[PDB]
Structure 1
Amino acid sequence: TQQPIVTGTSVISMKYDNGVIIAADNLGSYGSLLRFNGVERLIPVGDNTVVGISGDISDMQHIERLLKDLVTENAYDNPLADAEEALEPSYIFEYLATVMYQRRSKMNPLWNAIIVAGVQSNGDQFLRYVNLLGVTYSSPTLATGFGAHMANPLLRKVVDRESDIPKTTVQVAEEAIVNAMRVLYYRDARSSRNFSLAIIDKNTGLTFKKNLQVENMKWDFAKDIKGYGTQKI
Structure 2
Amino acid sequence: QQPIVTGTSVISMKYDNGVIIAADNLGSYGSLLRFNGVERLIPVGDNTVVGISGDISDMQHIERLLKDLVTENAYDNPLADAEEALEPSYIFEYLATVMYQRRSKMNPLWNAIIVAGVQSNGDQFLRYVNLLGVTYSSPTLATGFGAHMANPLLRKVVDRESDIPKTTVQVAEEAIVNAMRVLYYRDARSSRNFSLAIIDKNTGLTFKKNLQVENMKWDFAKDIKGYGTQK
TM-score where L is the length of structure 2: 1.00
Task: Show CA shifts across 1:163-218 (max 9, x none).
Answer: 00000000000000000000000000000010000000000000000000000000
1:153 deviates by 0.1
Using the alignment, how far apart are the partners of 2:31 and 2:171 within structure 1?
34
Task: Show CA shifts across 1:101-133 (max 9, x none).
Answer: 000000000000000000001000000000000
Unaligned 5+ segments in structure 1 are none
1:43 deviates by 0.3
Task: Show CA shifts across 1:28-69 (max 9, x none).
Answer: 000000000100000000000000000000000000000000
Aligned CA RMSD, in angstroms, stands at 0.3
Using the alignment, how far apart are the partners of 1:211 and 1:121 within structure 2?
29
Using the alignment, how far apart are the partners of 2:192 and 2:170 within structure 1?
21
Using the alignment, how far apart are the partners of 1:33 and 1:222 within structure 2?
25
Task: Show CA shifts across 1:129-166 (max 9, x none).
Answer: 00000000000000000000000000000000010000
Unaligned 5+ segments in structure 2 are none
- Among the aligned pairs, what percent are the same residue? 100
Match of 2:139 in 1: 140
Match of 1:154 in 2: 153
1:78 deviates by 0.2
Matches within 5 A, 1:1-233: 2-232=1-231
SS of the aligned residue for 1:203 comes to coil
TM-score where L is the length of structure 1: 0.99
SS of the aligned residue for 2:13 comes to strand
SS of the aligned residue for 1:157 comes to helix
